[PDB]
């Protein structure tokens, strides 16, 4: 169990895309450090928010 | 008609050079299979791809 719980924390801190951590709670909803927006248009205000919640032990 | 200057031929060759330039930039991609082969096509896109290749290897 100590081995399994250790791996989950290891995954959360090391889940990274383009030098950005995802599963550590960076992009949560309540208290996020960074807010993720995707550009899906050719105009000024075509933006939709993305949430990735905290997934540590 | 003015015979000492051929403006209509000038427009023909000036457009010819530009179309000849873009044609050469497309042989590279088809012969290689990669959209970006030299800098200038997309500076940010080339940089992000190399950082991804760091993770892949």
Q: Which among A50, A56, A12 is positioned nearest to A34, based on CA atoms?
A: A50
**Would you call B43 an interface residue with chain A, using a CB distance cutoff of 8 Å?**
no
Method: cryo-EM
- List of residues 6+ apart from A22 with CB closer than 8 A: A15, A16, A52
- The 3-state DSSP class for residue A48 equals strand
Q: How far is the CA of B7 from the CAs of A29, B11, B19, in angstroms?
A: 64, 6, 19
Q: Would you call A43 an interface residue with chain B, using a CB distance cutoff of 8 Å?
A: no
**Resolution of the coordinates, Å:** 3.2
Task: Find all residues with CB under 8 Å of A19, minimum gap 6, and list them.
Answer: B51
Element (H or E) spanning B56, and its range? helix B43-56
Element (H, E) at B22: helix B7-32
Alpha helices (H) along chain A: 2-14
Question: Nearest CA to CA, how far is B44 from chain A (Å)?
Answer: 12
CA distance B41 to B43: 7
Secondary structure of residue A53 in the 3-state scheme: coil
Tokens, residue A12? 């959360």
Q: Which of B44, B45, B51 is nearest to A17 (CA)?
A: B51
- Phi, psi of B47, rounded to the nearest 5 degrees: -65, -45
Q: Which residue of B has its CA nearest to A16?
A: B55
**Distance between CA B33 and CA B31 in Å, rounded?**
6
Tell whether A18 lies on the interface with B, counting CB pairs under 8 A.
yes
Identify from B47, B54, B55, B56 which residue to disrupt to test chain A contact, counting A C-beta atoms within 10 A and taking the largest count: B55
In this structure, the dihedral spanned by the alpha carbons of residues B36, B41, B43 and B45, taken in order and rounded to 10 degrees, is -50
| DSSP category for residue A24 | T
């Amino acid at each position: 169990v100590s081995q399994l719980v250790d791996e989950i924390d290891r995954i959360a801190s090391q889940a990274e895309f383009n030098k950005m951590k995802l599963l550590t709670g960076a992009f949560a909803r309540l208290n996020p450090t960074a807010s993720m927006w995707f550009h899906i248009g050719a105009n000024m205000h075509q933006r939709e928010r993305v949430y990735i919640e905290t997934m540590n032990t | 008609m003015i015979i000492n200057h051929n403006v209509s031929a000038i427009f023909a060759h000036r457009t010819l050079k530009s179309n000849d330039a873009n044609l050469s930039k497309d042989i590279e991609k088809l012969s290689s299979g990669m959209r970006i082969n030299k800098a200038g096509d997309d500076a940010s896109g080339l940089a992000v791809s190399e950082k991804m290749r760091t993770q892949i290897a």
